[PDB]
C-alpha cells in the first residue's frame, strides 16, 4: 500500500 497509514 503506497498510502501513509493515518
Amino acid at each position, epitope marked *: *500500500n*503506497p*498510502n*501513509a497509514n*493515518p
Partner: antibody
Amino acid sequence: EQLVESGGGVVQPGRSLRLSCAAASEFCFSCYGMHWVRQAPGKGLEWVAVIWHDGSNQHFADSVKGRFTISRDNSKNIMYLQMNSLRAEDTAVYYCASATRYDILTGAFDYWGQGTLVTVVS
Amino acid sequence: IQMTQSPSTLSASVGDRVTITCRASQSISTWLAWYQQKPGKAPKLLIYKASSLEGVPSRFSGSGSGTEFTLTISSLQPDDFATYYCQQYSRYWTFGQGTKVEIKR
C-alpha cells in the same frame, strides 16, 4: 485539492522530458501515494508509475521500467517524472492521479489532473 | 494481471438498463474500480472495491468477486455517453480496455 501536471511537449526519439505534478496545498500531498496514468490519443488508460507517500518505494509498469524515474519533494508539494529514452510508444497524455481513500489496499483514483500531452516525433 | 471488458461498444436508448462486465486474468478479490471518461476531460471515479459507490448518481451499481465483475446503470440518461473502464488494485494497478456507450435516439 487539485493536481496540475506540467512539462509536456514535443521532442525527438531518445530525448528526455521531466514531467511535474503540483498539488494544491489543501491536498495532503504527504499522505498518499502518487501515480502516473497515461493515455495514447487513440487507445485507453495504461498505468505507468507510482511513488510511495514518503518516497521510500516506487513501482513502474514493465512498459517503462528501466527508462522512467520518479521522485517527490514533499516540502515543495511536487512529484517529478523523469522520462528518458523516449520512443514513439510514449506519445500520450500524462495524468497524475491519487487514491485518497485508505484501506488495506489503495488504488481507486478519485483525484486526477487535466494531463500533459507528450508527443515523440521527428 | 490482465483485465478484459465486454462488450467494447454498446448502444442503448435513454431509460434502458445497461450492463458492463469486467474479467480478470487471475483472481482479484474485491479491489476493483469503475471509471467514466467523457472524451473531453480526465476520468471520473464511479465505484470502488467492486460494489461501494461514492459516481454520485444512485443509478450506478457494482457487482462481482474473484474474476467476474459487472457495472450496471439503472436508467440511462443522455449524459452517460462515455467510455467506461474497470481497474483492479489487488496486485499493483492495471486497467481494462474500456467500453464505449453510445445512445440511441
